[PDB]
Coordinates of C-alpha atoms and ligand atoms in Angstrom, one line a residue:
Chain A
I1 CA -41.2 -15.9 -27.1
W2 CA -38.2 -18.0 -27.8
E3 CA -37.2 -21.3 -28.5
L4 CA -36.1 -23.5 -25.4
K5 CA -35.5 -26.8 -27.9
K6 CA -36.7 -28.1 -31.1
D7 CA -40.3 -27.5 -31.1
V8 CA -40.7 -26.4 -27.5
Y9 CA -41.2 -22.4 -26.9
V10 CA -41.2 -20.4 -23.9
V11 CA -43.7 -17.3 -23.4
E12 CA -42.9 -14.9 -20.7
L13 CA -45.9 -13.5 -18.6
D14 CA -46.5 -10.6 -16.2
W15 CA -48.6 -13.0 -14.0
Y16 CA -51.5 -11.4 -11.8
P17 CA -55.2 -12.2 -11.8
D18 CA -56.8 -11.3 -15.0
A19 CA -53.8 -10.2 -16.7
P20 CA -54.1 -9.9 -20.2
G21 CA -51.0 -12.0 -21.3
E22 CA -48.8 -12.0 -24.7
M23 CA -50.3 -12.2 -28.2
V24 CA -47.9 -15.0 -29.9
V25 CA -47.8 -16.1 -33.7
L26 CA -47.3 -19.7 -34.3
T27 CA -46.1 -20.6 -37.8
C28 CA -46.6 -24.4 -39.0
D29 CA -43.3 -25.8 -39.9
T30 CA -43.8 -27.1 -43.0
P31 CA -43.2 -26.2 -46.9
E32 CA -46.8 -26.7 -47.5
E33 CA -49.4 -23.6 -47.5
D34 CA -53.0 -24.7 -48.1
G35 CA -55.4 -27.0 -46.2
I36 CA -54.1 -26.8 -42.7
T37 CA -55.9 -26.7 -39.5
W38 CA -55.0 -26.5 -35.8
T39 CA -55.8 -27.9 -32.7
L40 CA -54.5 -27.9 -28.9
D41 CA -53.8 -31.2 -27.1
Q42 CA -56.2 -33.9 -26.9
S43 CA -59.1 -32.1 -28.6
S44 CA -59.8 -32.3 -32.1
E45 CA -61.6 -29.1 -32.2
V46 CA -60.0 -26.9 -34.9
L47 CA -58.7 -23.9 -33.5
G48 CA -57.7 -21.9 -36.7
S49 CA -56.9 -22.4 -40.2
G50 CA -53.9 -21.3 -42.2
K51 CA -50.0 -21.5 -42.1
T52 CA -50.2 -19.4 -39.0
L53 CA -52.2 -19.3 -35.7
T54 CA -52.8 -16.6 -33.5
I55 CA -53.4 -17.1 -29.9
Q56 CA -53.6 -14.9 -26.6
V57 CA -51.7 -16.6 -24.0
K58 CA -52.9 -15.6 -20.4
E59 CA -53.2 -18.7 -18.5
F60 CA -52.3 -22.4 -18.3
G61 CA -55.3 -23.4 -20.6
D62 CA -53.7 -21.7 -23.4
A63 CA -50.3 -23.4 -23.1
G64 CA -49.5 -26.7 -24.3
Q65 CA -48.9 -28.6 -27.7
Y66 CA -50.3 -27.2 -30.4
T67 CA -50.2 -29.2 -33.7
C68 CA -50.8 -28.3 -37.4
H69 CA -52.4 -30.9 -39.9
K70 CA -52.8 -31.3 -43.5
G71 CA -54.6 -34.0 -45.2
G72 CA -55.3 -35.5 -42.1
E73 CA -51.5 -36.0 -41.4
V74 CA -49.6 -34.2 -38.3
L75 CA -46.9 -31.6 -39.9
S76 CA -45.3 -30.6 -36.7
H77 CA -45.7 -29.6 -33.1
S78 CA -45.3 -26.8 -31.0
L79 CA -44.9 -26.9 -27.1
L80 CA -45.5 -23.6 -25.3
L81 CA -44.6 -23.0 -21.8
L82 CA -45.0 -20.4 -19.4
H83 CA -42.5 -18.4 -17.5
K84 CA -44.4 -16.5 -14.6
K85 CA -43.1 -13.1 -14.0
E86 CA -44.8 -12.1 -10.4
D87 CA -44.0 -8.3 -9.5
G88 CA -40.8 -8.2 -12.0
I89 CA -39.6 -11.3 -10.4
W90 CA -39.5 -14.7 -12.0
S91 CA -41.2 -17.4 -10.1
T92 CA -39.5 -20.1 -8.0
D93 CA -42.3 -22.3 -7.2
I94 CA -40.8 -25.5 -8.0
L95 CA -37.8 -25.4 -5.9
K96 CA -37.2 -25.0 -2.2
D97 CA -35.1 -21.9 -0.9
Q98 CA -32.6 -23.6 1.3
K99 CA -31.8 -20.1 2.5
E100 CA -27.9 -20.9 3.0
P101 CA -25.4 -19.5 2.6
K102 CA -27.8 -16.8 1.6
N103 CA -31.3 -15.9 0.4
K104 CA -32.5 -17.2 -3.0
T105 CA -30.1 -20.3 -2.8
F106 CA -32.1 -23.0 -4.7
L107 CA -29.0 -25.0 -5.6
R108 CA -26.1 -26.4 -3.6
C109 CA -23.0 -27.9 -4.9
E110 CA -19.7 -29.8 -3.6
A111 CA -16.6 -31.2 -5.2
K112 CA -14.5 -33.9 -3.2
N113 CA -11.3 -33.0 -4.9
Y114 CA -9.9 -30.4 -7.7
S115 CA -10.7 -32.9 -10.6
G116 CA -13.1 -30.8 -12.3
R117 CA -16.1 -33.0 -11.3
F118 CA -18.5 -31.8 -8.8
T119 CA -22.2 -32.8 -7.9
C120 CA -25.2 -30.4 -7.4
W121 CA -28.5 -30.9 -5.5
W122 CA -31.8 -29.2 -5.4
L123 CA -34.9 -30.1 -3.5
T124 CA -38.8 -29.8 -4.3
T125 CA -42.2 -31.2 -2.7
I126 CA -43.4 -31.6 -6.4
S127 CA -43.9 -35.4 -7.7
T128 CA -45.8 -34.6 -10.8
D129 CA -44.8 -34.4 -14.7
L130 CA -41.5 -32.9 -13.6
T131 CA -38.5 -32.6 -15.8
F132 CA -35.2 -30.9 -15.0
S133 CA -32.2 -30.1 -17.7
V134 CA -28.8 -29.3 -16.7
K135 CA -26.1 -27.3 -18.7
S136 CA -22.8 -25.9 -17.6
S137 CA -20.0 -23.9 -18.7
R138 CA -17.0 -21.9 -17.2
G139 CA -17.2 -18.5 -17.9
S140 CA -20.3 -16.6 -19.6
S141 CA -19.0 -14.4 -22.1
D142 CA -16.5 -17.1 -23.6
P143 CA -18.1 -20.2 -22.3
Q144 CA -15.9 -23.3 -21.8
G145 CA -17.6 -26.8 -22.2
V146 CA -19.0 -28.6 -19.1
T147 CA -20.9 -31.8 -19.8
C148 CA -23.3 -33.0 -17.1
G149 CA -25.5 -36.1 -16.8
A150 CA -28.9 -36.6 -16.0
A151 CA -30.8 -35.0 -12.9
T152 CA -32.3 -37.9 -11.1
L153 CA -34.0 -38.7 -7.5
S154 CA -31.3 -39.2 -5.0
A155 CA -33.2 -39.2 -1.7
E156 CA -36.7 -39.0 -0.4
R157 CA -37.3 -37.4 3.3
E164 CA -39.1 -33.6 0.4
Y165 CA -37.4 -34.7 -2.8
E166 CA -33.7 -34.4 -3.4
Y167 CA -32.4 -34.4 -7.0
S168 CA -28.7 -34.7 -8.0
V169 CA -26.7 -34.3 -11.1
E170 CA -22.6 -34.9 -12.0
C171 CA -20.9 -32.6 -14.3
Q172 CA -17.3 -32.7 -15.1
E173 CA -15.3 -29.6 -17.0
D174 CA -14.1 -31.1 -20.6
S175 CA -10.5 -29.5 -19.9
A176 CA -9.6 -29.2 -16.4
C177 CA -6.5 -27.7 -14.7
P178 CA -6.4 -29.2 -11.3
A179 CA -3.1 -27.0 -10.4
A180 CA -4.3 -23.8 -11.8
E181 CA -5.8 -20.6 -10.3
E182 CA -9.4 -20.5 -11.4
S183 CA -10.2 -16.8 -13.0
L184 CA -13.8 -17.7 -14.2
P185 CA -16.6 -19.4 -12.2
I186 CA -18.5 -22.3 -13.1
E187 CA -22.1 -21.5 -14.1
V188 CA -24.6 -24.3 -13.5
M189 CA -28.0 -23.7 -15.2
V190 CA -31.1 -25.8 -14.4
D191 CA -34.3 -25.8 -16.5
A192 CA -37.4 -27.0 -14.5
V193 CA -40.9 -27.8 -15.8
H194 CA -43.8 -28.6 -13.8
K195 CA -47.0 -29.3 -16.2
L196 CA -46.8 -26.4 -18.4
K197 CA -45.0 -23.9 -15.5
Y198 CA -41.3 -23.2 -17.0
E199 CA -39.2 -21.7 -14.4
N200 CA -34.9 -21.8 -14.2
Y201 CA -32.4 -21.6 -11.8
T202 CA -28.8 -20.6 -11.5
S203 CA -25.6 -20.9 -9.6
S204 CA -22.2 -19.7 -9.8
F205 CA -19.0 -20.5 -8.0
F206 CA -15.1 -21.2 -8.2
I207 CA -14.5 -25.2 -7.6
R208 CA -12.3 -23.9 -4.9
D209 CA -14.9 -22.5 -3.0
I210 CA -17.2 -25.7 -2.8
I211 CA -14.3 -28.1 -2.1
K212 CA -15.6 -30.6 0.6
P213 CA -13.0 -33.5 1.1
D214 CA -14.2 -37.1 1.8
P215 CA -13.6 -38.4 5.3
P216 CA -9.9 -39.6 6.7
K217 CA -9.3 -43.1 5.4
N218 CA -8.1 -46.3 7.4
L219 CA -8.2 -44.8 11.1
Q220 CA -6.2 -46.7 13.5
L221 CA -4.8 -46.8 16.9
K222 CA -1.4 -47.9 18.5
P223 CA -1.2 -48.0 22.0
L224 CA 2.0 -46.5 24.1
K225 CA 3.0 -47.2 27.8
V230 CA -2.6 -44.3 22.2
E231 CA -1.1 -43.0 19.0
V232 CA -3.6 -41.9 16.3
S233 CA -2.8 -42.7 12.6
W234 CA -4.7 -42.2 9.3
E235 CA -4.3 -41.7 5.6
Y236 CA -5.8 -39.6 2.8
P237 CA -9.0 -40.4 1.0
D238 CA -8.7 -42.0 -1.8
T239 CA -11.1 -39.8 -3.6
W240 CA -8.5 -36.8 -2.8
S241 CA -6.2 -34.8 -5.5
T242 CA -2.9 -36.3 -6.0
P243 CA 0.0 -35.6 -5.6
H244 CA -0.8 -35.3 -1.7
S245 CA 2.6 -33.7 -1.6
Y246 CA 0.9 -31.0 -4.0
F247 CA -2.7 -31.1 -2.8
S248 CA -2.1 -31.3 1.1
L249 CA -4.7 -31.5 3.7
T250 CA -4.9 -30.6 7.2
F251 CA -6.7 -32.5 9.8
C252 CA -8.6 -31.7 13.3
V253 CA -8.2 -34.3 15.8
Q254 CA -11.1 -34.2 18.7
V255 CA -11.7 -36.5 21.9
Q256 CA -15.2 -36.2 22.9
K264 CA -13.6 -29.7 23.7
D265 CA -10.4 -31.4 23.4
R266 CA -8.8 -30.7 20.1
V267 CA -5.5 -30.5 17.9
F268 CA -4.7 -29.4 14.6
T269 CA -1.9 -30.9 12.4
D270 CA -0.7 -31.4 9.0
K271 CA 0.4 -34.8 9.9
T272 CA -1.4 -38.1 9.1
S273 CA -0.9 -39.1 12.9
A274 CA -1.2 -38.0 16.7
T275 CA -1.0 -38.9 20.0
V276 CA -3.9 -38.5 22.5
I277 CA -5.3 -39.4 25.6
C278 CA -8.7 -41.5 25.9
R279 CA -10.0 -39.8 28.9
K280 CA -13.8 -40.1 28.4
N281 CA -15.4 -43.2 27.5
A282 CA -13.5 -43.6 24.6
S283 CA -14.7 -41.1 21.4
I284 CA -12.0 -40.2 19.1
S285 CA -12.8 -38.3 15.6
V286 CA -10.8 -37.1 12.9
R287 CA -11.6 -34.9 9.9
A288 CA -9.9 -32.8 6.9
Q289 CA -9.6 -29.6 5.2
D290 CA -7.9 -28.4 2.4
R291 CA -4.4 -27.0 3.9
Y292 CA -3.8 -24.0 1.9
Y293 CA -7.4 -22.6 1.3
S294 CA -10.3 -22.3 3.6
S295 CA -13.1 -24.3 2.1
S296 CA -15.5 -27.0 4.0
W297 CA -14.3 -29.6 6.5
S298 CA -14.9 -33.1 5.7
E299 CA -17.4 -35.0 7.6
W300 CA -15.9 -36.8 10.6
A301 CA -14.1 -40.0 10.9
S302 CA -14.4 -41.8 14.0
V303 CA -13.2 -44.9 15.9
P304 CA -13.8 -45.7 19.5
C305 CA -10.9 -46.0 22.1
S306 CA -9.8 -49.0 23.5
Chain F
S8 CA 18.1 -23.6 -7.3
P9 CA 15.4 -21.4 -5.4
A10 CA 15.8 -22.1 -1.5
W11 CA 12.3 -24.1 -1.8
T12 CA 12.4 -24.7 2.2
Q13 CA 12.7 -21.2 3.2
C14 CA 9.8 -20.3 0.3
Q15 CA 7.4 -23.0 1.9
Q16 CA 7.6 -21.1 5.2
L17 CA 7.2 -17.7 4.1
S18 CA 4.1 -18.9 1.5
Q19 CA 2.4 -20.8 3.9
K20 CA 2.7 -17.7 6.6
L21 CA 1.3 -15.9 3.4
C22 CA -1.9 -18.1 3.4
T23 CA -2.4 -17.6 7.2
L24 CA -2.2 -13.7 6.9
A25 CA -4.4 -13.7 3.8
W26 CA -7.1 -15.1 5.4
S27 CA -6.6 -13.2 8.9
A28 CA -5.3 -9.7 8.0
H29 CA -8.7 -8.5 7.0
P30 CA -12.6 -9.0 7.4
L31 CA -13.9 -11.3 5.0
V32 CA -17.1 -12.0 2.9
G33 CA -19.0 -14.8 1.7
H34 CA -17.5 -16.6 -1.5
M35 CA -20.9 -15.5 -3.2
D36 CA -21.1 -12.2 -1.6
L37 CA -19.8 -8.9 -3.4
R38 CA -20.1 -10.5 -6.8
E39 CA -21.3 -8.2 -9.8
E40 CA -22.1 -8.1 -13.1
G41 CA -18.9 -6.8 -14.4
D42 CA -16.6 -9.1 -12.6
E43 CA -16.2 -11.3 -15.7
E44 CA -14.4 -8.1 -17.6
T45 CA -12.6 -7.2 -14.6
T46 CA -10.5 -10.5 -14.0
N47 CA -8.8 -10.4 -17.3
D48 CA -6.5 -7.5 -16.2
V49 CA -5.3 -9.3 -13.1
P50 CA -2.5 -12.0 -13.2
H51 CA -3.7 -15.6 -12.5
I52 CA -1.7 -18.9 -12.6
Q53 CA -3.3 -20.4 -15.5
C54 CA -3.3 -23.6 -17.3
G55 CA -0.1 -24.2 -18.8
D56 CA 1.9 -21.9 -16.9
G57 CA 4.0 -24.6 -15.8
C58 CA 3.0 -24.8 -12.1
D59 CA 1.3 -28.2 -12.3
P60 CA 3.4 -30.9 -10.6
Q61 CA 4.5 -32.3 -14.2
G62 CA 5.7 -28.5 -15.4
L63 CA 7.6 -28.0 -12.0
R64 CA 9.7 -31.3 -12.8
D65 CA 10.6 -30.2 -16.4
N66 CA 11.4 -26.6 -15.6
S67 CA 10.4 -24.7 -12.7
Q68 CA 11.5 -21.0 -14.0
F69 CA 8.2 -20.9 -15.8
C70 CA 6.3 -21.3 -13.0
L71 CA 8.7 -19.1 -10.6
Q72 CA 8.2 -16.2 -13.2
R73 CA 4.6 -16.3 -12.9
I74 CA 4.3 -16.5 -9.1
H75 CA 6.8 -13.6 -8.7
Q76 CA 4.7 -11.5 -11.3
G77 CA 1.7 -12.1 -9.1
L78 CA 3.2 -11.3 -5.9
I79 CA 4.8 -8.0 -7.5
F80 CA 1.2 -7.2 -8.6
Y81 CA -0.4 -7.7 -5.4
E82 CA 2.2 -5.7 -3.6
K83 CA 1.8 -2.9 -5.8
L84 CA -2.2 -2.9 -4.9
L85 CA -1.7 -3.2 -1.2
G86 CA 0.5 -0.1 -1.3
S87 CA -1.9 2.0 -3.6
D88 CA -4.6 4.2 -2.6
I89 CA -7.2 1.3 -2.6
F90 CA -5.8 0.4 0.8
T91 CA -3.9 3.6 2.0
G92 CA -6.8 5.9 1.4
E93 CA -9.9 6.8 3.2
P94 CA -10.8 4.7 5.2
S95 CA -7.0 4.6 6.1
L96 CA -5.2 1.5 7.4
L97 CA -1.8 2.1 9.2
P98 CA 1.4 0.5 7.8
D99 CA 1.6 -1.4 11.3
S100 CA -1.9 -3.0 10.4
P101 CA -2.3 -6.7 10.0
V102 CA -2.6 -5.7 6.1
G103 CA 0.8 -4.2 6.5
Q104 CA 2.3 -7.4 7.9
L105 CA 0.5 -9.1 4.9
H106 CA 1.9 -6.6 2.7
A107 CA 5.4 -7.1 3.8
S108 CA 5.2 -11.1 3.5
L109 CA 4.4 -10.4 -0.2
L110 CA 7.3 -8.3 -0.4
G111 CA 9.2 -10.6 1.5
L112 CA 8.7 -14.0 -0.4
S113 CA 9.1 -11.7 -3.8
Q114 CA 12.5 -11.0 -3.0
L115 CA 13.5 -14.7 -2.5
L116 CA 12.3 -15.6 -5.9
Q117 CA 14.2 -13.5 -8.3
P118 CA 17.4 -15.2 -8.9
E119 CA 20.8 -13.7 -9.4
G120 CA 21.3 -11.9 -13.1
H121 CA 17.7 -12.3 -14.2
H122 CA 15.2 -9.3 -13.7
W123 CA 11.7 -10.0 -13.4
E124 CA 10.4 -6.7 -12.0
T125 CA 8.1 -4.9 -14.9
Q126 CA 5.9 -1.7 -14.6
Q127 CA 2.6 -1.7 -13.2
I128 CA -0.9 -0.8 -15.2
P129 CA -2.0 1.6 -12.3
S130 CA -5.2 3.2 -13.7
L131 CA -6.9 4.9 -11.3
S132 CA -8.5 3.4 -8.2
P133 CA -12.3 4.6 -6.9
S134 CA -12.8 8.0 -5.3
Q135 CA -15.7 7.3 -2.9
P136 CA -14.8 5.5 0.4
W137 CA -17.5 3.1 0.0
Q138 CA -16.1 1.8 -3.2
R139 CA -12.7 1.7 -1.9
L140 CA -13.7 -0.9 0.9
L141 CA -15.8 -3.2 -1.5
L142 CA -12.4 -3.3 -3.6
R143 CA -10.3 -4.5 -0.6
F144 CA -12.6 -7.6 -0.3
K145 CA -12.4 -8.5 -3.6
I146 CA -8.7 -7.9 -4.1
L147 CA -7.9 -10.0 -0.7
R148 CA -10.1 -13.0 -1.7
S149 CA -8.4 -13.1 -5.1
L150 CA -5.0 -13.2 -3.5
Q151 CA -6.2 -16.1 -1.2
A152 CA -6.8 -18.0 -4.4
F153 CA -3.4 -16.8 -5.7
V154 CA -1.4 -17.6 -2.9
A155 CA -3.0 -21.0 -2.1
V156 CA -1.3 -22.3 -5.6
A157 CA 1.9 -20.4 -4.8
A158 CA 1.8 -22.4 -1.2
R159 CA 1.2 -25.8 -3.1
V160 CA 3.9 -25.2 -5.7
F161 CA 6.5 -24.5 -2.8
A162 CA 5.3 -27.4 -0.6
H163 CA 5.8 -29.5 -3.4
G164 CA 9.0 -28.4 -4.5
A165 CA 10.7 -28.8 -1.2
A166 CA 9.5 -32.3 -0.9
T167 CA 10.4 -33.5 -4.4
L168 CA 13.2 -30.9 -5.7
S169 CA 15.3 -30.6 -3.0
Chain L
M2 CA -33.0 5.2 -8.6
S3 CA -33.4 1.4 -9.4
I4 CA -35.3 -0.7 -7.0
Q5 CA -32.8 -3.5 -8.3
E6 CA -29.9 -1.4 -7.4
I7 CA -31.2 -0.8 -3.9
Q8 CA -31.5 -4.4 -3.1
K9 CA -28.2 -5.1 -4.2
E10 CA -26.6 -2.3 -2.0
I11 CA -28.5 -3.7 0.8
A12 CA -27.1 -7.2 0.2
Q13 CA -23.5 -5.7 -0.2
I14 CA -24.0 -3.8 3.3
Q15 CA -25.3 -7.1 4.7
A16 CA -22.5 -9.1 3.7
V17 CA -19.7 -6.7 4.9
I18 CA -21.2 -6.2 8.2
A19 CA -21.5 -9.8 8.7
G20 CA -18.0 -10.0 7.8
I21 CA -16.9 -7.4 10.3
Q22 CA -19.1 -8.7 13.2
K23 CA -17.2 -12.2 12.6
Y24 CA -13.8 -11.0 12.5
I25 CA -14.7 -9.1 15.8
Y26 CA -15.1 -12.4 17.1
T27 CA -11.6 -13.4 16.3
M28 CA -10.4 -10.7 18.4
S47 CA -15.1 -0.2 23.0
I48 CA -16.1 -3.6 21.7
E49 CA -19.2 -3.8 23.7
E50 CA -20.2 -0.4 22.4
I51 CA -19.3 -1.4 18.7
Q52 CA -21.3 -4.3 19.0
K53 CA -24.5 -2.7 20.2
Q54 CA -24.1 0.1 17.1
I55 CA -23.9 -3.1 14.7
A56 CA -27.1 -4.4 16.1
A57 CA -28.6 -1.3 15.8
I58 CA -28.3 -0.7 12.0
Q59 CA -29.0 -4.5 11.2
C60 CA -32.4 -3.5 13.2
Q61 CA -32.6 -0.8 10.8
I62 CA -31.6 -2.5 8.0
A63 CA -34.9 -5.0 8.6
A64 CA -37.1 -2.2 9.0
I65 CA -36.1 -0.4 5.8
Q66 CA -36.5 -4.1 3.8
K67 CA -40.1 -3.9 4.7
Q68 CA -40.7 -0.6 2.9
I69 CA -39.3 -2.2 0.2
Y70 CA -41.8 -5.4 0.4
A71 CA -44.6 -2.9 0.3
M72 CA -43.5 -1.4 -3.1
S91 CA -39.4 6.9 0.1
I92 CA -37.2 6.1 -2.7
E93 CA -35.1 9.3 -2.2
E94 CA -35.4 8.9 1.3
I95 CA -34.0 5.3 1.0
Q96 CA -31.0 6.5 -1.1
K97 CA -30.0 9.0 1.3
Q98 CA -30.2 6.2 4.1
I99 CA -28.1 3.8 2.3
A100 CA -25.5 6.3 2.0
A101 CA -25.8 7.3 5.4
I102 CA -25.7 3.5 6.7
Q103 CA -22.6 3.5 4.7
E104 CA -21.0 6.2 6.5
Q105 CA -21.6 4.6 9.7
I106 CA -20.0 1.3 8.6
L107 CA -17.0 2.9 7.2
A108 CA -16.5 4.8 10.9
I109 CA -16.9 1.2 12.8
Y110 CA -14.4 -0.2 10.4
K111 CA -11.8 2.4 10.9
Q112 CA -12.1 1.9 14.6
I113 CA -11.7 -2.1 14.4
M114 CA -8.9 -1.8 12.0
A115 CA -7.3 0.6 14.6
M116 CA -7.9 -1.8 17.3
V117 CA -6.0 -4.5 15.8
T118 CA -3.0 -2.3 14.7
Ligands
LIG1 C1 -34.1 -18.7 -18.0 O1 -35.2 -17.7 -17.9 C2 -35.0 -16.3 -18.8 C3 -36.1 -15.7 -18.6 O2 -37.3 -15.9 -19.3 C4 -34.5 -16.7 -20.1 O3 -34.1 -15.4 -20.9 C5 -34.4 -15.7 -22.2 O4 -33.5 -16.4 -23.1 C6 -33.8 -16.4 -24.2 C7 -32.6 -17.1 -25.0 O5 -31.5 -17.1 -24.6 C8 -33.8 -15.0 -25.3 O6 -34.2 -15.2 -26.6 C9 -33.6 -14.4 -27.1 O7 -34.2 -13.6 -27.7 C10 -33.6 -12.4 -28.8 C11 -34.5 -11.3 -29.1 O8 -34.1 -9.9 -28.8 C12 -34.6 -9.0 -29.4 O9 -34.0 -8.8 -30.8 C13 -35.0 -9.2 -31.9 C14 -34.1 -8.9 -33.4 O10 -32.8 -9.5 -32.9 C15 -36.3 -8.8 -31.8 O11 -36.9 -9.5 -32.7 C16 -36.8 -9.5 -30.5 O12 -38.2 -9.5 -30.7 C17 -36.3 -8.7 -29.2 O13 -36.8 -7.7 -28.9 C18 -32.9 -13.3 -29.9 O14 -32.5 -12.8 -30.6 C19 -32.1 -14.3 -29.4 O15 -31.4 -15.3 -30.4 C20 -32.2 -15.9 -31.4 O16 -31.7 -15.7 -32.8 C21 -30.5 -15.8 -33.0 C22 -30.4 -15.2 -34.5 O17 -30.7 -13.7 -34.5 C23 -30.2 -16.9 -33.2 O18 -28.8 -17.3 -33.5 C24 -30.4 -18.0 -31.5 O19 -30.4 -19.2 -31.7 C25 -32.0 -17.6 -30.9 O20 -32.5 -18.4 -31.6 C26 -33.0 -15.4 -28.2 O21 -34.1 -15.6 -29.0 C27 -34.8 -14.0 -24.4 O22 -34.7 -12.9 -24.8 C28 -34.6 -14.0 -22.8 N1 -35.5 -13.3 -22.1 C29 -35.5 -12.0 -21.8 C30 -36.5 -11.5 -21.2 O23 -34.9 -11.3 -22.6 C31 -33.4 -17.6 -20.1 O24 -33.1 -17.9 -21.5 C32 -33.6 -19.0 -19.5 N2 -32.8 -20.0 -19.7 C33 -31.5 -19.8 -20.0 C34 -30.5 -21.0 -20.1 O25 -31.4 -18.8 -20.9

């Protein structure tokens, strides 16, 4: 048993039918020593007496909020959650495996730029008594501070959650040597699970689409601009672009190109970091004519 | 001055070769528990080394000393037993051209009068062929990150400091 | 040896073979491509032994698969030289 947060504890269990579970000793958080009784959740049935209570934790009926009392008054609360270990593997019931870029990928993160801000999302089918908690750092042995916001619903189609984080002391121009770590606690009823992702910002970069795509006729000159959210100065954080008619494609480092509107009209442009192979932006498109 | 426009071309070419010279893995593959400690012995363009746009305007010598150091380090590595040992790569291989591009760029940065060549801390490479192969992937993706920063520095200097 | 190490080693092999395979696309090729698929078909069969939960024989097979991969790598690098 270890403390997750104030008055909240996690009990790790080898999980299989008729498993004996783990013995735990709870201590009432009080200076008092006499006249204490214990209960669980809503029931008033006294489960035990004394400063401490010994319980066998082997199923979800043994988890929940244990409360000690004296003189009719509540002294403290202790919430016990279960972390299932199934065949030496911690359970991943709560989140859906996205299986990309590899097996056991539950969290996906993206950054629009090198600012040190990024967004992560995960998926679950569960709608019930569901709480997530997100913490982050750069490095594990000597962690540097990262602040995240609250995780909240961002879409329903399968429920998608998102959270925003920002490195406290970012260096957009530096060569990262320690990866960002993202850690997600997930609680469903009394079932505790947790998840992790490790990455360099540079590997999760995906620029916003090209801005203000315009056409100039010539007896069909294409031009566009860097996206507003991209890192500055553009002379340092250079982009490269792919221009497609639809395959009729050209690649350029300029913000303009000349093409021929053969088919019924489709022209599309997308952007990538010029110097490091991260993700392409979504396409920007404008019809010909 | 450091002949910015020649450094842009050679550093840009390095980015192309760094990705094309050798097979790649995914950014989450070949990760392992000891990677956190191993990273400290390799040099990086860190916070405060002067390679941010503001640092380059104030005094580009700091950044260029660091970039040169990193190129020399990766050169020594690409010429070491890690890459020349079994399974052997020939000098005319794509990696050999990549090694030559590191050497070509590093010769350009070292001004006249200043001496930035140091001594390597070679240590000892692995002895099993499979472990050599894994380390090549890890080294080259570390190089990809380094040369991307270098290419931005030289692109920015040619555009604003020439 | 450990069960955790064996699954890590398989993942490294899977990553490595994926990288050589993709690299070949950018450039006997038909023979090498057939050889790659046969190891993967073998990797899948080995993986099923694991999801049943011999060990000594698997460790011997990982080393043997590693020897096959190193030989392929040397040929490919020689082809681009
Ligand atoms: C994601 O899921 C995993 C799997 O459950 C969690 O892993 C557990 O994480 C917790 C917290 O990090 C670990 O709890 C730690 O237990 C240690 C006990 O280690 C031995 O040593 C003591 C004697 O020193 C013995 O009494 C004990 O029985 C053990 O044999 C504690 O030492 C740790 O520190 C505590 O005490 C120190 C002061 O000593 C305080 O400073 C700390 O704040 C803390 O109170 C800590 O309690 C637990 O061991 C991990 N599991 C396993 C199996 O090891 C992850 O924590 C979870 N999520 C995250 C974000 O980690």
